[PDB]
Structure 1
Amino acid sequence: MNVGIKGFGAYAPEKIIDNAYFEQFLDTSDEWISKMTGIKERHWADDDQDTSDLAYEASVKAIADAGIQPEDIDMIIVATATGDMPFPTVANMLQERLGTGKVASMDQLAACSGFMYSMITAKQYVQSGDYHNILVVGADKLSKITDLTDRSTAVLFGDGAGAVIIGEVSEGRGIISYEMGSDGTGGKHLYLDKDTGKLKMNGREVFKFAVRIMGDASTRVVEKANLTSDDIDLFIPHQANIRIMESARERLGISKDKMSVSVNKYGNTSAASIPLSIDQELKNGKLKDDDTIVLVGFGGGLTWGAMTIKWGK
């Protein structure tokens, strides 16, 4: 069976925060933040706009791009680490707000790698024959869990959502290959502090792990598709660090003009990261039907995923 992306949409909130903003509360600079991360601005949800609101905005665009009606959706999976509540889930709230039938809806947690975990989950369902139009969202409001007193993390993170309908697509298109994994030995390097409610990171260890796993997962998922570097039209890594993305690109062996970079405008958006990058490449006319794209990400867990997708219905 050919299972792919029948429609796509992405949303970042209105409020844009520049690097210079942090200088009034923290010992940081534009020059420091830019050099180290490649981030120039990030988007932050308003106080009354939660993860579910970002998810909603991305999903309605996905459904219009898919040319289906809400009643066509036969399951909702939201990848988020920052759901409004553990119950009801962002997935539940979208069932109500999108006005779908009373279909199965759940949040899946794999941090930064969640969007890829959920798309793969959706694929398994569609391949059974029982599901035709599965809404997969990657949404994080990371601004809720950012320690604004820590210069090392306060500057990293922003908010957004992406969404795809996973269903049947035409011959040769869709999800060709995927790789998922985890390594709980790295949990202590990137976690949500149980007391403060804030993201805690051993940056140097996350860096070293990100460089290796991003390199490994992307080359492996290309080999599994029986493709080489030369067959890839776009490399779309999870957007967190320009150095990490560069290192992964070098391992894979593809040219810089072939790597999607949106970290400069969104910072890191966890599950929303890859979709916000895809949105940029669609609108700039760098991604079209029949292009072969490689996604890769790592996350707190530690988690990782990678997929080879041929673009189009």
Structure 2
Amino acid sequence: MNVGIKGFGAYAPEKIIDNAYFEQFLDTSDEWISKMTGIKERHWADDDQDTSDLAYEASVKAIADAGIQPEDIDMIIVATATGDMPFPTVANMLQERLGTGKVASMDQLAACSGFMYSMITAKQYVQSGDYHNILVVGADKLSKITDLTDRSTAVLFGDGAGAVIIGEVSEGRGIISYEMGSDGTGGKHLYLDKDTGKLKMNGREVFKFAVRIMGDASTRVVEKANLTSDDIDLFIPHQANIRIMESARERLGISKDKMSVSVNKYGNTSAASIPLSIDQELKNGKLKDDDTIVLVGFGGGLTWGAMTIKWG
């Protein structure tokens, strides 16, 4: 069987925040932020728009793109680290808002690597032959856990969502190979502070891990796919920092005209970052049926994931 993406959709909220905005209360500048992260703007959800709302906009587009009805969905999986509540989950809320049947729904937590973990999980279910159209979403409203007084993190995160329908795809297409991992010793380097409720990060430690793991993991899934860098049409890494992405790109061997870059317009959106990037490449005519791409991400945990996909 060939399991792949039957439909795709992504969404970013209305309010756009440019770099200049942070100078009103932080010791920063457009130049500094651009130079250190590659970010120029980022999108923040309105105060009445939560993670579930972002997830729902991405999900309706992915369903429409798959050409199926909400009744065709047989499972909903949501990768998020910022769900509205622990229960009901964002997945539970989509079940009702999308009007699907009373199908299994659950959220999965693996931070920025969440979308990858969830697509792979969906693959397993579809593979069993018992599921045919699984809605997988990667959504996060990071503005909810950002500490605005911390210049290091305040300018990094944005809000957004991406969604796909995982199911059987035509011959040769789909998820070819994949890799998932975690390393809890790095937990103290990126975590949600218990009584502050804000993201705390050891930037240098996360930077070092990101660059090595994203390059290593990418190389492994390309080989397990029996391919080489030259066969990859698009390299789509978690969009956390343009300097991390560039290092990982080198360590991979792929040319820059082949790496998707969207961190400049969205900042870091955790689980939604790879899908938002995919959306741009689709809209700018850079990703086509039968193109071969490599998705790779890292995240708090620490966690990582990577996969090779034959598009269409």
Q: TM-score range by the shorter chain?
A: over 0.9
SS at match of 1:139: strand
Partners in 2 of 1:35 and 1:219 — Cα distance?
28
Greater Cα shift, 185-194 or 244-253: 244-253
How big is each residue's C-alpha offset from its partner over 1:191-247, in whole Å with a ceiling of 9 and x where there is no partner? Answer: 000010000000000000111111111001101100000000000000011111011
SS at match of 1:207: helix
How big is each residue's C-alpha offset from its partner over 1:129-176, in whole Å with a ceiling of 9 and x where there is no partner? Answer: 000000000000000000001000000000000000000000000000
Partners in 1 of 2:255 and 2:204 — Cα distance?
27
Partners in 2 of 1:133 and 1:80 — Cα distance?
20
How big is each residue's C-alpha offset from its partner over 1:81-136, in whole Å with a ceiling of 9 and x where there is no partner? Answer: 00000000000000000000000000000000000000000000000000000000
Partner of 2:14: 14
Partners in 2 of 1:252 and 1:209 — Cα distance?
15
Partners in 2 of 1:160 and 1:209 — Cα distance?
24
SS at match of 1:246: helix
How big is each residue's C-alpha offset from its partner over 1:4-38, in whole Å with a ceiling of 9 and x where there is no partner? Answer: 00000000000000000000011011000000000
Partner of 1:217: 217
Partners in 1 of 2:227 and 2:250 — Cα distance?
17
Partners in 1 of 2:129 and 2:179 — Cα distance?
23
Partners in 2 of 1:247 and 1:151 — Cα distance?
23
| TM-score, normalisation: structure 2 | 1.00
SS at match of 1:5: strand
Structure 1 gap ranges (5+): none
Pairwise CA distance, 1:283: 0.2
The aligned runs of 1:259-278 (5 Å cut-off) are 259-278=259-278
Structure 2 gap ranges (5+): none
Pairwise CA distance, 1:248: 0.9
Pairwise CA distance, 1:251: 1.2
Partners in 2 of 1:253 and 1:188 — Cα distance?
31
SS at match of 2:175: strand
Partners in 2 of 1:240 and 1:111 — Cα distance?
12
| TM-score, normalisation: structure 1 | 0.99
Pairwise CA distance, 1:79: 0.1
Number of aligned residue pairs: 312
Partners in 2 of 1:55 and 1:213 — Cα distance?
28
Q: What CA RMSD, in Å, does the superposition of the two structures yield over aligned residues?
A: 0.3
Write out the 4+ residue segments of structure 1 that deviate beyond 4 Å after TM superposition: none
Partners in 2 of 1:258 and 1:212 — Cα distance?
19
Identity %: 100
Pairwise CA distance, 1:252: 1.2
